[PDB]
Amino acid sequence: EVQLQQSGPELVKPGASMKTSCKVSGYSFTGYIMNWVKQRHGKNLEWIGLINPNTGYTTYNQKFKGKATLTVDKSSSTAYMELLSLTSEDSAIYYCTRGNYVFDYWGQGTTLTVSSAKTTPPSVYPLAPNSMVTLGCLVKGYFPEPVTVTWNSGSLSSGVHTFPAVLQSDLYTLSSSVTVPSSSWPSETVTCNVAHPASSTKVDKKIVPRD
């Protein structure tokens, strides 16, 4: 069972640099070429460069010549990538993957977020207004990802969509919808529960019918 285990997500300021790792097991680290690949939110895959763990030899994509330094530690069969002078365009998922002609095994990826923003808890606003009825929670102005949205502490889980967050002036916003039978609301309380682990924030908002 070949396996490339990458280190956890990282969050850094613009200008700073960052180092991330990929520990291999299930085969001989020094026998195969290691590459790194960038994927910026769900688009094309970009080869960054390769290192030959046995020889130390590196080549880079011209795009990344200045940016990225590949190294390895043979003894711990670990590969490293350092990224320098980070800007916002560097925010992406980065993979280590193995191969010298096809990429036959990949790490699980690691997410880099580059941002000036400071840890900020979200404002949570209720969205209140046929047999079915739809309610929502607006969750705005938080950093960083992620937030978790549940409804009635998770006991209301069918009929729910939470939309992907988007960036607005360095902060995230999303909303969540839940659809319920109108016999249920407002006869029954509906509350969305928002957690933001980074800021140790836990907020519950009751949806109340507009006056």
């Binding site: 969205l127 207004p129 929502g136």
Partner: peptide, 25 residues
């Protein structure tokens, strides 16, 4: 699409912002 529109909450208004939301589900 099942479509729903939502006016700004009073809570948001007091902070001086106003987001109008629409779900197309």
């Amino acid at each position: 699409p099942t479509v729903s529109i939502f006016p700004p909450s009073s809570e948001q208004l007091t902070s001086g912002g106003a987001s109008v939301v629409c779900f197309l589900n």
